[PDB]
Symmetry: D2
Subunit: 119 residues, 4 copies
Amino acid sequence: MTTSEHIAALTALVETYVMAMTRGDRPALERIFFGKASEVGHYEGELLWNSRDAFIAMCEDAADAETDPFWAISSVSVQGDIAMLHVENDWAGMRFDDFLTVLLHEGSWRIVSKVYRIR
Amino acid sequence: MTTSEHIAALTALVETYVMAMTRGDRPALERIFFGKASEVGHYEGELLWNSRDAFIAMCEDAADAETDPFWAISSVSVQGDIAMLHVENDWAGMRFDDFLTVLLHEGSWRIVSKVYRIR
Amino acid sequence: GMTTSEHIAALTALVETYVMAMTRGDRPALERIFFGKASEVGHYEGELLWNSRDAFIAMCEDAADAETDPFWAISSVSVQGDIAMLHVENDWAGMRFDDFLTVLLHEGSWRIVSKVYRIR
Amino acid sequence: MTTSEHIAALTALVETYVMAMTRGDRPALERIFFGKASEVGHYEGELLWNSRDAFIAMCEDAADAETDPFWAISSVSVQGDIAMLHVENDWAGMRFDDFLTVLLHEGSWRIVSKVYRIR
């Protein structure tokens, strides 16, 4: 893969991610997040440190089969088999900035870490 | 154009830029760089501040019709109709880090400024 | 050689100087921090506005405010040798902007080459 | 802290991290990294997913009290209380690109994840 092809793959991963969150698509999220990955951020004053399972469970609870999510890729950085992404996304009526670290492992990009902040 | 489509359009822009530079393709470079765009950096300790015409003339002078040039996209950032790009590329036997700012105008991403350093 | 941390501190100072000089309509400060051939480019009122340093300094004078404490934030800073690119959020004349600045370390100091912006 | 102070705190964090790794300074590393933080990357063809403790242990094992580390900050990005840093750093005769995700929690910036690649 060229960096351009990797950037297209990373763009596709973001689209998969935002739609899977909105729809509560557990298999889709498990294919793009490592099992050891965490979702970390402040929510209602508390520091939340969610496992992949917990993160997905929250998406499933808040799932909506009709809403079209609103999102944008604000930044993508790539160095060899690692990448950084800044995604702007709406979820449960709030606007978030997601900072995602990703690793190309055995042919596909998987999220290692997700940190977010609510605007 | 969607958020994904702008990222793809910006990566296409980089490919066009690197190949047009290598090949000394004036038509392509004039389509992707605004007329008042500048290419700025140091060369042999001297500040080179090139107009688009000057920059393109240098590409024409050094043009290579056959080589497959090395290049990579290190980062792409977008806020509405503006973008920032970090591109690594080879030109005339030197390796460069290029920082480019771009504006989406009348449906086309066109480069406003290019600053570079020679490694 | 000077470290990347030291350069980032200098760029941070440059951004503060830039935002305050713009807000205050400080012509000497703006002429110091922007190269003579620098450009300010973006869409304004639906049209492409390509401003020379003389044009945008006159615009800063026009909208000058002697006392307002302007909002600004550095969203990103990237540095490679003697070049830098910065994403700055700032308020000016009642509007919020995202500015993408290209900067060059020249003769011992960081100086702005160009600024592209979009109004939120 | 002000916007300038936050940027300063983040570059200071990088300085602390790189020196602490070189010296095998466990107290420093435990202060700057969350306990649940992970260090992830490919190392000699395999995926290495280290806990903070496992990462600190390797630093201690390779500790050197005299070497002046070679490093550079390539980028710093901030959105509210989250940040991402791209740091170039030399360790054990190899050059790395480190992508760090950081969170401002209770007044200090601490590392949530460190993803890397070896050049």
